[PDB]
């Protein structure tokens, strides 16, 4: 048996659980990669600068980039929790209004 | 045998006396330990959370 797809789905689910402001740019990169891989060819002609951009977008390892985002967000969340517990916040714009 | 098995059952029963919100974590861990003993050893490489 094989379960790579389930592992990727679990990684995406855990990324969605650890929501931050920078998840949208990763989702945009993923959807752009899917769109470029799905049609391609049609609207790429001349403009070597455009060709370089298209190749860079297509060759980006989206499937191996979510995991780095996980560790990037984990430390930020730990720091925010430490500030909330030990030090407190004065700004009312924080989303701590739940408690 | 009695002394080699009844002790574990007694410990499990005593564990319910000192109930806490984390008891379900141990309950799930016990299921996981037995599940990947008569199964698993498969599903090949790739991914890291699993």
């Amino acid at each position: 048996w094989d379960l790579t797809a389930f592992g990727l789905v679990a990684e995406w689910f855990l990324a969605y659980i650890l929501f931050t402001r920078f998840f949208y740019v990763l989702g945009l990169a993923a959807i752009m990669q899917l769109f470029f891989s799905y049609f391609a060819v049609h609207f790429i002609s001349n403009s070597w600068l455009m060709w370089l951009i298209i190749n860079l977008v297509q060759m980006a390892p989206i499937s191996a980039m979510v995991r780095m985002y996980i560790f990037f967000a984990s430390f930020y969340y730990v720091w925010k929790s430490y500030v909330h517990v030990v030090d407190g916040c004065n700004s009312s714009t924080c989303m701590m209004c739940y408690k | 045998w009695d002394l080699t098995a009844f002790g574990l059952v007694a410990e499990w029963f005593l564990a319910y006396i000192l109930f806490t919100r984390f008891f379900y974590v141990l309950g799930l861990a016990a299921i996981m330990q037995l599940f990947f003993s008569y199964f698993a050893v498969h599903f090949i490489s790739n991914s890291w959370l699993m």
Binding site: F71, F75 | S45, W48
Partner: protein
Amino acid sequence: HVMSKHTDFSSEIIGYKAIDGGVTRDIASTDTCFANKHADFDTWFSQRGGSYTNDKACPLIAAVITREVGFVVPGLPGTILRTTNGDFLHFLPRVFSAVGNICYTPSKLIEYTDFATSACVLAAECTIFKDASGKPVPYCYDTNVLEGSVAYESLRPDTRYVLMDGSIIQFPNTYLEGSVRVVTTFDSEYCRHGTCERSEAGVCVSTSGRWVLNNDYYRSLPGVFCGVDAVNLLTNMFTPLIQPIGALDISASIVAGGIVAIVVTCLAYY
């Protein structure tokens, strides 16, 4: 009918062999039931401390003999002799003393210790096949044994062959036979005597004469190397020398690695 014990040709027998599942195999003391036609087998087993119960649903006993006895029947190992009382007997004739159990490859004859892990393709001297029109045509190794037979060497690899009983034979092309073997495969299932297996196209190299096919099951077995191409084979075989032997590479050490960076970054500023 009830099996009976006979003592004819007893002085010509050196030992005994067992036939299980249509393929001859060695005998072990732990086995409990056999089909026997010889009385000296009782002394053979008793000297080794064995006992058994006679039944027809248990492997048969055949005796190795130094004399050409009986005649060859296609599909049956060894030779078959019928006694004056009508009972049939089985023997294993040989040309040279250094003979155990011999199985037939499409080109040569190679001895084996276990049929499951050997290059064996057929275990019979002569075999019969269904032709294009649906009629039996006999094949044999030595044409002098039976008139009208075709040599086994005329067979070709990667060609489907069907026996009289519906079994399928498919053996891959080879370039070297012996202690070390090299094989080539295609994207089609290959089948041997009683076992059909699925394999992918590629090239495999083995340090032993064991059966080799291109799949994960054989790839996990030791002493087997495979690759998608000749160049890729070298990379595959040299990969383990610089790679761990398992999935022990847990990437959870990065938090500890970055702890030092955070500590030094804070310490420099302070």
